Structure formats: C-alpha cells, structure tokens
C-alpha cells in the first residue's frame, strides 16, 4: 500500500508518501524507515531512486516514509529559505509521524539519507535516541560552506550577505541562511555520538561528494558498533545512475538490514 500523507513542521505543511506492507496484520507492528532526500532533490529522488528503495524496503517488511523537506517538492516553503537545521526539524517531525502510527513499532525506527539528506540523517542520529539504525547514501559529512561559496562569484557572495537570494544553478536560488548554517553541525564532528548501527554506501566515482569523507566517517565509527559497515560502489557515481549500481545499493541495504533482525516474517506467522 502506498498513500500520500501530510504533517506540519515549523508552521508549514509537508507532503510525503507512506509505504505500508500489505501483509501487515491487524495487531502487528512493523519496523519503519524515514528517508531524507538531497539538496535540490525531492522525495522521489534522482531517476526515482527513492521510489525503488522504498518499494524494496516495504517488500522486506518496513513501513517507509518519504517526504519533501520544506522548500522542496510539494511541501510548503521556498527553497531559498531552506537550511540544514530546518531540515533536521523536518526530519525529527517525520519520526514523530511514524511513532504515532499504531502499526509501526516505535522502538524499531531508523533513517536513510542521500547526500545532503545523509548530512541531516547523521546530525539527527547524533541527537535523537529514537533512531535505531542509520543508512547513508553518498552522504555529505564534511564542511561545505567554503566549497559552496567557492562556486559563486564575489559579487554574488556580497548580494547573499545583503539578503538576496542568489542563483546556485539549474534555476535554484538560495539565501545566506543556508550558507551560514550548513556547517553549524559538521557530521564528522558528531559521528562518534552515534552508537547504533550505521551503513555507509558511497561511490568511488562520486564527483560531487568525495569518497574521502565517507572513509573518514567510517574510520570514526567503525568500532562504535560491530554492525557498522562501509560499502564502496566500484564505478558508482553520486546518485548511482547506472541500473546495476542502483540494484547493488538496494541489495546491500537489504542484506545489511537483515543482519539487524528488525523484521521477523517467520515469527509473524
Ligand atoms: Cl528554516
């Protein structure tokens, strides 16, 4: 079952989509995953990657919530006002939403994030005791403010300082709040607070987010939980465009989740 949902965050509506397993009995409760999209992404994500990921997770027995951050997709708000802390607010609200569903096991909720959404996932997991596992795809874990500004002309940076929304490419505009707070929390600085299982998947041909950041992240957390894993997708680009890479990412994610024993369909009988 797939159905649209809405909830409020920071005074504004978020629209999302909820995947519910069809074999979920009346009293039964399922583990759940909230999925966080990337920068200038939406809840379907590139070449519908999140749709495919969510369908596979739901087939595996998870309730899955995908939603548009405020300022993205069909949620309220303007993109130029978006900030990473604002997306952490939204992300926490999506956990609230899953926690209040009577067919979700409130003690078996985890998160999945792609790139900037992986940044959000890591930040939220460093704080939120409700998160029981973290899945990071192509995650942006390192400082980004300087790299973002280095892509802008000096006169554009001044206009940003003066309060203008400036063009950042492909028709997307951004105000300074994003640049001021994208490094308020840098994930590498708080990764050692995450003690639940973390799966890091990163392509060795990612031209957007260097693999180096995923390697550093794994180095920090590898012995904090003996289920933590780093999977490097050989030939994989930032959003796993080649079909075989998308399949590999999904297969590795399902396999890893199996190791955590979150679903027990045999016992469900
Ligand atoms: Cl905000």
Author numbering: 1 to 269
Question: What's the publication's text?
Answer:
Here we report on the structural and biochemical characterization of PET46 (RLI42440.1), an archaeal promiscuous feruloyl esterase exhibiting degradation activity on semi-crystalline PET powder comparable to IsPETase and LCC (wildtypes), and higher activity on bis-, and mono-(2-hydroxyethyl) terephthalate (BHET and MHET). The enzyme, found by a sequence-based metagenome search, is derived from a non-cultivated, deep-sea Candidatus Bathyarchaeota archaeon. It shares the core alpha/beta-hydrolase fold with bacterial PETases, but contains a unique lid common in feruloyl esterases, which is involved in substrate binding.
The best PET46 crystal grew in space group P 61 2 2 and diffracted to a resolution of 1.71 Å. One monomer is present in the asymmetric unit (ASU), which shares the common fold of the α/β-hydrolase superfamily, with the core of the enzyme being composed of eight β-strands connected by seven α-helixes. In addition, a lid domain composed of three α-helixes and two anti-parallel β-strands is present (Leu141-Val186). The active site is composed of the catalytic triad Asp206, His238, and Ser115, as inferred from structure homology to other α/β-hydrolases. A phosphate ion and two ethylene glycol molecules were present near the active site, likely coming from the protein buffer, crystallization solution, and cryoprotectant. Further structural differences around the active site are found in the enlarged loop between β4 and α3 (Loop 1; Asp68-Glu78; deep blue in Fig. 2a), which folds back to the outside, and the shorter loop between β10 and α10 containing the catalytic His (Loop 2; Arg234-Arg242; magenta in Fig. 2a). Note that the lid of PET46 has potentially adopted a non-optimal conformation/orientation for substrate binding.
